[PDB]
Amino acid sequence: MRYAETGYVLEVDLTKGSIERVATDPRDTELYLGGLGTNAKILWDRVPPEVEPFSPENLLIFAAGLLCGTPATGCNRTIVSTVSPQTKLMAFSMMGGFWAPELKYAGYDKIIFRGKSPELVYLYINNDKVEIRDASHLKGKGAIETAEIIKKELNEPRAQVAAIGKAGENRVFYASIEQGRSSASRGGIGAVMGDKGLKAVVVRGTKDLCVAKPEEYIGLCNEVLDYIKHREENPIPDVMPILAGLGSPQEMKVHDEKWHTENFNWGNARTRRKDFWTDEVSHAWEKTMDKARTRLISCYNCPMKCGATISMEGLPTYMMKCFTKLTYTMAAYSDLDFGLRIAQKATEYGLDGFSAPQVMAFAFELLEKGILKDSDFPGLPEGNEERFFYLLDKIVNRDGIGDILANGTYWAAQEIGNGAEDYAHNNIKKHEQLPLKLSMLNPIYYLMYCTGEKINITQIEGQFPQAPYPKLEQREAFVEDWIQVPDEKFKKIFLEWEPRGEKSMPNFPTVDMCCDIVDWQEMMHYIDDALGQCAGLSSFPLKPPYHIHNYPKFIAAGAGIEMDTEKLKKAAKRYRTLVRAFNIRRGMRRVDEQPPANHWKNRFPELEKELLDSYYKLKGWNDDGIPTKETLDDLGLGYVGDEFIKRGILSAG
Amino acid sequence: MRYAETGYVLEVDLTKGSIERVATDPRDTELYLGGLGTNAKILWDRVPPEVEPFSPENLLIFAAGLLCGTPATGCNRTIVSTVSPQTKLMAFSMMGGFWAPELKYAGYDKIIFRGKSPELVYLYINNDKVEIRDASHLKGKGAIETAEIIKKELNEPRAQVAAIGKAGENRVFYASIEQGRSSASRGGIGAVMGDKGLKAVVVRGTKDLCVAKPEEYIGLCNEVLDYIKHREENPIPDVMPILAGLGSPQEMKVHDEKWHTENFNWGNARTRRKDFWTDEVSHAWEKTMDKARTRLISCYNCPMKCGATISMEGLPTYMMKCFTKLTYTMAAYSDLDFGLRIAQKATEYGLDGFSAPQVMAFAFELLEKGILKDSDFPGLPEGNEERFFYLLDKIVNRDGIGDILANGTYWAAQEIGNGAEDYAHNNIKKHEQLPLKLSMLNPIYYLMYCTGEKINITQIEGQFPQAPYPKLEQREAFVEDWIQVPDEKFKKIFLEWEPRGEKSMPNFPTVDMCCDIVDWQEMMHYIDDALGQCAGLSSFPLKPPYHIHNYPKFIAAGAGIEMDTEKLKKAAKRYRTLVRAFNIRRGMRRVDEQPPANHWKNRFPELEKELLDSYYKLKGWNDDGIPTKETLDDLGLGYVGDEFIKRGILSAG
Numbered sequence A, B: 001m002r003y004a005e006t007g008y009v010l011e012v013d014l015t016k017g018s019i020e021r022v023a024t025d026p027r028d029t030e031l032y033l034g035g036l037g038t039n040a041k042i043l044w045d046r047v048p049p050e051v052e053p054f055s056p057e058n059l060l061i062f063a064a065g066l067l068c069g070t071p072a073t074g075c076n077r078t079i080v081s082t083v084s085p086q087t088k089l090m091a092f093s094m095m096g097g098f099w100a101p102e103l104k105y106a107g108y109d110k111i112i113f114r115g116k117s118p119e120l121v122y123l124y125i126n127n128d129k130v131e132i133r134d135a136s137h138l139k140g141k142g143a144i145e146t147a148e149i150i151k152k153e154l155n156e157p158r159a160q161v162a163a164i165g166k167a168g169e170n171r172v173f174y175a176s177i178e179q180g181r182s183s184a185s186r187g188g189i190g191a192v193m194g195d196k197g198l199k200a201v202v203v204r205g206t207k208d209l210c211v212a213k214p215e216e217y218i219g220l221c222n223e224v225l226d227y228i229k230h231r232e233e234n235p236i237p238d239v240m241p242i243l244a245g246l247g248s249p250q251e252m253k254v255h256d257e258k259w260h261t262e263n264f265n266w267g268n269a270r271t272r273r274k275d276f277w278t279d280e281v282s283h284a285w286e287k288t289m290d291k292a293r294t295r296l297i298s299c300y301n302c303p304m305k306c307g308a309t310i311s312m313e314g315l316p317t318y319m320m321k322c323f324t325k326l327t328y329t330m331a332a333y334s335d336l337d338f339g340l341r342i343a344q345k346a347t348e349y350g351l352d353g354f355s356a357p358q359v360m361a362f363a364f365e366l367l368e369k370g371i372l373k374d375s376d377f378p379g380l381p382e383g384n385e386e387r388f389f390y391l392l393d394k395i396v397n398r399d400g401i402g403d404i405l406a407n408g409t410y411w412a413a414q415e416i417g418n419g420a421e422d423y424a425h426n427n428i429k430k431h432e433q434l435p436l437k438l439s440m441l442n443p444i445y446y447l448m449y450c451t452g453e454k455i456n457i458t459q460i461e462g463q464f465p466q467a468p469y470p471k472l473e474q475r476e477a478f479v480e481d482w483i484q485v486p487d488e489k490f491k492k493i494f495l496e497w498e499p500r501g502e503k504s505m506p507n508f509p510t511v512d513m514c515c516d517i518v519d520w521q522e523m524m525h526y527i528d529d530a531l532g533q534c535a536g537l538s539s540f541p542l543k544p545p546y547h548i549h550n551y552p553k554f555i556a557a558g559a560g561i562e563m564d565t566e567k568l569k570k571a572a573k574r575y576r577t578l579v580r581a582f583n584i585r586r587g588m589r590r591v592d593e594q595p596p597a598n599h600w601k602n603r604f605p606e607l608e609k610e611l612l613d614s615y616y617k618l619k620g621w622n623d624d625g626i627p628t629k630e631t632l633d634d635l636g637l638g639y640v641g642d643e644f645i646k647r648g649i650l651s652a653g
């Protein structure tokens, strides 16, 4: 029998209203583990490149990680996968909370949606009971608001609900899916969900979930908890607060945001304010945050409590975590009070807290320059704050100028013209990046910006420190108990690495060292997004409780399959290449893999070419970014190599 | 991980030439075991009643039993299922030999064909490699002949081949599938295969097949091999050799056919020859058999060697077992030399050995009577023997009157008319029966002739004795060591049974007694056809090694699921009802459940009514043969009851 996984999925046709439970192939588990990996397998051989994002044949997959529903601490992530309406590439999005584990308790590993529903509806799951309900009375309702009404309707107080706001219903290219203190935020997956007339997905589960090696599996679980205690008694020395400990960026706990407000760019990723964090500002923000934060809350089976309930006066309560705390504030040249109030509106609407702020600031720059006229913004209010609330409503409704801005900075500038493309200066593969315009070229981050399939920098980094220690004693101390490294050489790299001089960036670490680092950091994220493990306890923070050495044990004891360190490394490489192959088939080439032209002020073309060339070699790809026939056959992806040749993507010989 | 079964099937669309391996649902195994069981499930919810047998939507399935490819002695049966072109009902047909086990070693449980290939093809399976080959150079070739050329083409001497003959290609309604010394013979499965344009299925396998509890399973295997040694040293006293030991009827060993020739109707189930077995006949048949029989051969993993390679002077070699040894002979009022000769042609042509002889025999009665003219048989030889060879050619080619006769006796008489219906007197549901026209009504066999879904009396009988003993001492001796009975009450039945007196047929055994006997006998067959076990070691002979008490142990140790006598009983009841439900949906009713009008000289209309009334009650059926909503709900077949009501077959309460 199957373990960790349930071995079953739901196939839903929203056009015919048909529902079907189908057993999964156990071979898929051995090759692609689960979550993102198996999502990639499904999208590959069911979604050909001729399928458009808002086409009925486009798929919307809700996947619970392999180890979700087990006692594994923090393992609770949902992986939503589809074809992005913004980037035209694959879009996988992660969501925390309690939804994924509930699905497992209901008896399912995934839910795959195809076609479209003519009427607004939501899916109701209660163990073996599955049905489609009408949701017309929920039209326009906010994401969180929607969940509460449903749980009253069905009389299921303990059901978990993933819903879309008005933004998703109106197919905003950066619309999200909201569930309590969790969000599948990026990729426009909310736009696809709305396009299919799917207002929400409600699931309740009370079945058992089994593991293969009970005693052994709980042993590793306790080993993690013990490490979390010890780790939280020994934070990383001389790092900032929101990087010393475990979990997601603890921005709800720490009031200090000097690193953020003085190193990140305000507005449309435009302005840098070196001396913003004054005493008056630090006190005003701490007061606002103490009054707004009700409680620090956690996800399922996790003690880190990264999120927080936010209560602004005269506004409904919503939940928040990580960097969305500042994006609306910094993009509007305002304060933390404004940011918390508009984030409430945006979370209910279901918008990406990264792109949305940059799109609105992008619009005001165009209005400032004169590329957009005041006639495009009728009835526009005077205040800077009021203008953001104004433009926010225009976007979610796709009203007038809001209809164009609802497509993202790339497509909006494309349609606007008149030099609007010049102000879309912060995109990679048509996707907005973090507002960061640094001085000196970073050889490690350059690679992560160019090749990251998530196209987000915060979701590929983690395991290697972002900066070197000034003193050698500090490095020797760090590498002392750095048991998470796959190889001793990662310790030796950090020892030699210095902030200034003959061993500083961009010329050090070397090109070969950078490639190895990027490959390791990326590998841990892909393992996380297949197992369902929150990165906060794994691939994100320094020296995590989960790593390349005990992960194989969790899989073996949990799922009952043969798994070791090397076999796991190869597995992660397998469906990370498959994801790559999916984007190749959709027209992605080396040309698309370049950072923004103004991302760094000091550029080194010859070093950057050597970096991307060497990294491709390590991955086993072409000098155009395409996985060769040799590496594909070696990975067990022969059917990919055949289709590449047949499609002319790869040449025979 | 799955056990005994491989857990995969092959989905092949012949019209599109697509090949696909699909993991199965382990719940189907729990409810329907496998083989014939799971095949019924597949046909039920994929082949609705509006589908024609020669429609491309009709399915042809090759299933290997649950315990095929395991060390279990005699377990190697293939189960072919489809919708019969002759009866318009469900058709399942069993084939022995070496084919099923081979499929298991390749890594598959079933092959499921849909659609029609426009050109003659065959499927080549070698482990993970599966491809469709052009087979136009094989057109017209015989089943066995086709096999040898194919194996040489592929350089695969250890490959197993199931093939159709010309008869299958020309969609003769009783065309068969031949696999060396084994054949799927009845129902017209060869017709559907030819109709789809499938000449053969070649399979080679070299993969491991695992069992769950090794030590316990091989222990069970050793228990059977012991019982076989002891059974062969103790044949059932006062029973003729062919039916006094294990295996299929050993007619290839025993020359003595006094019982058959003097009790079975020669010709068109017409002539009883009470004193046919003379000294001169016996010596002649003995001489022919001794010179013809090259060697007694077995199936995979069995020591009984029921088969015999037959070599007639001037003819190629073929394999034969059981009763075809007499059918062609008796139908033509000929001898054994002719029988063995023509049966070589018939086997290579791919024809059923029960119907062909009766069909040809039926035609000559119509010619003798006047309904058919010499004009219908142009080029008709003068000799009896030469006429049968002539009409055999006409049928396989569907040439002239061979087109009409190729549809069977039921439809032939329907189309011929002019009173030809009267000579189609040996039918049940448009399916030719054994040439048996006894004197006194047998209550036990009456119920079997009416309800058996195979519609063939020899594939439902077995566990209970066909006749009583003259002496009580004989009865007491037999029931002393009769461990295979499901209850003690069977022992008491046999003891009371007498050939003459108050305790003789038709009045004894009683109606309730007769029902319990038919139920037991039928149940054992369905377990065999699901597991893949040969009836010659189970449901066919008296006191077999496999039985209702040790069968659960095999299923548990073999497949690794829970099982016991009562669960197994109900499990067999579940998919016997399912098969019953499939034919009810195709229009079958009580009216169709009647033996030939002249099957018994002495009839008892009132007893016959009570007999069937009672049997329907034990089954849990209506007074019209249809399974009640209750028993369907009780068997976990709730989906069936719903559709029945929806279709109006069952009144809503």
Ligand SMILES: CC(C)(COP(=O)(O)OP(=O)(O)OC[C@H]1O[C@@H](n2cnc3c(N)ncnc32)[C@H](O)[C@@H]1OP(=O)(O)O)[C@@H](O)C(=O)NCCC(=O)NCCSC(=O)c1ccccc1
Residues within 6 Å of the ligand: A249, A263, A322, A323, A434, A436, A438, A439, A440, A441, A442, A445, A457, A458, A466, A467, A499, A500, A501, A504, A505, A506
């Ligand atoms: C200190 C760094 C490492 C880089 O900041 P800086 O120190 O400012 O580095 P700079 O490149 O600006 O150069 C500084 C000055 O020194 C100069 N100079 C430089 N090198 C050299 C040299 N070798 N030799 C000599 N001089 C050198 C250089 O010319 C410049 O001087 P000028 O003004 O031009 O005259 C850190 O702040 C960082 O974030 N980096 C990681 C990358 C990243 O973005 N990761 C975060 C992803 S988001 C995330 O994780 C998150 C988001 C939300 C929520 C949660 C999480």
Ligand SMILES: CC(C)(COP(=O)(O)OP(=O)(O)OC[C@H]1O[C@@H](n2cnc3c(N)ncnc32)[C@H](O)[C@@H]1OP(=O)(O)O)[C@@H](O)C(=O)NCCC(=O)NCCSC(=O)c1ccccc1
Residues within 6 Å of the ligand: B249, B263, B322, B323, B434, B436, B438, B439, B440, B441, B442, B445, B457, B458, B461, B466, B467, B468, B499, B500, B501, B504, B505, B506
């Ligand atoms: C002896 C029987 C039991 C029946 O044969 P018989 O003895 O002839 O039984 P009858 O019914 O013909 O009557 C005889 C005479 O006695 C008379 N009479 C009868 N009852 C009574 C009474 N109670 N009281 C008084 N008198 C009674 C009756 O009137 C008649 O006298 P008349 O001439 O009319 O004046 C046996 O031969 C048999 O095969 N039966 C099993 C059923 C079957 O067909 N199974 C095989 C399936 S194929 C197979 O397995 C296989 C095929 C190929 C390869 C391998 C396998």
Ligand SMILES: Nc1nc2c(c(=O)[nH]1)N[C@H]1C(S)=C(S)[C@@H](COP(=O)(O)O)O[C@H]1N2
Residues within 6 Å of the ligand: A077, A094, A095, A096, A097, A181, A182, A183, A184, A185, A248, A249, A321, A322, A323, A458, A459, A528, A529, A532, A533, A534, A535, A536
């Ligand atoms: N497995 C996994 N966990 C992850 C992440 C991820 O990308 N993969 N992202 C982290 C970051 S940067 C944030 S801001 C939060 C957001 O969690 P959410 O998806 O529930 O909103 O998740 C964290 N946990």
Ligand SMILES: Nc1nc2c(c(=O)[nH]1)N[C@H]1C(S)=C(S)[C@@H](COP(=O)(O)O)O[C@H]1N2
Residues within 6 Å of the ligand: A092, A093, A094, A095, A176, A183, A184, A185, A186, A187, A320, A321, A322, A323, A324, A346, A347, A350, A351, A352, A353, A354, A458, A459
């Ligand atoms: N509306 C909204 N957008 C959001 C967030 C959020 O909490 N709400 N979280 C941000 C954070 S912290 C992260 S790490 C990314 C997570 O990426 P993903 O949700 O696409 O996997 O989304 C960002 N966008």
Ligand SMILES: Nc1nc2c(c(=O)[nH]1)N[C@H]1C(S)=C(S)[C@@H](COP(=O)(O)O)O[C@H]1N2
Residues within 6 Å of the ligand: B077, B094, B095, B096, B097, B181, B182, B183, B184, B185, B248, B249, B321, B322, B323, B458, B459, B528, B529, B532, B533, B534, B535, B536, B540
């Ligand atoms: N499981 C099972 N085994 C069975 C049978 C059957 O119907 N089911 N038929 C028996 C009989 S009567 C005969 S004659 C032989 C025929 O073997 P064949 O189908 O390979 O020609 O199978 C024997 N074994």
Ligand SMILES: Nc1nc2c(c(=O)[nH]1)N[C@H]1C(S)=C(S)[C@@H](COP(=O)(O)O)O[C@H]1N2
Residues within 6 Å of the ligand: B092, B093, B094, B095, B176, B182, B183, B184, B185, B186, B187, B320, B321, B322, B323, B324, B346, B347, B350, B351, B352, B353, B354, B458, B459
């Ligand atoms: N061509 C051919 N027809 C045959 C046979 C055979 O061996 N070859 N077996 C006969 C016997 S003895 C029996 S019991 C049935 C078996 O039925 P089935 O093979 O359709 O399951 O087929 C009959 N027809």
Ligand code: SF4
Residues within 6 Å of the ligand: A074, A075, A076, A096, A097, A246, A247, A248, A297, A298, A299, A300, A302, A303, A304, A305, A306, A307, A534, A535, A536, A537
């Ligand atoms: S580390 Fe934070 S975001 Fe991750 S599971 Fe724990 S509480 Fe949730």
Ligand code: SF4
Residues within 6 Å of the ligand: B074, B075, B096, B097, B246, B247, B248, B297, B298, B299, B300, B302, B303, B304, B305, B306, B307, B534, B535, B536, B537
């Ligand atoms: S008993 Fe006879 S027919 Fe059955 S498997 Fe053994 S040899 Fe073959």
Ligand SMILES: [Mg+2]
Residues within 6 Å of the ligand: A093, A094, A095, A096, A182, A183, A184, A185
């Ligand atoms: Mg998220």
Ligand SMILES: [Mg+2]
Residues within 6 Å of the ligand: B093, B094, B095, B096, B182, B183, B184, B185
């Ligand atoms: Mg057969």
Ligand SMILES: [W+6]
Residues within 6 Å of the ligand: A249, A322, A323, A458
């Ligand atoms: W983040």
Ligand SMILES: [W+6]
Residues within 6 Å of the ligand: B248, B249, B322, B323, B458
């Ligand atoms: W037989």
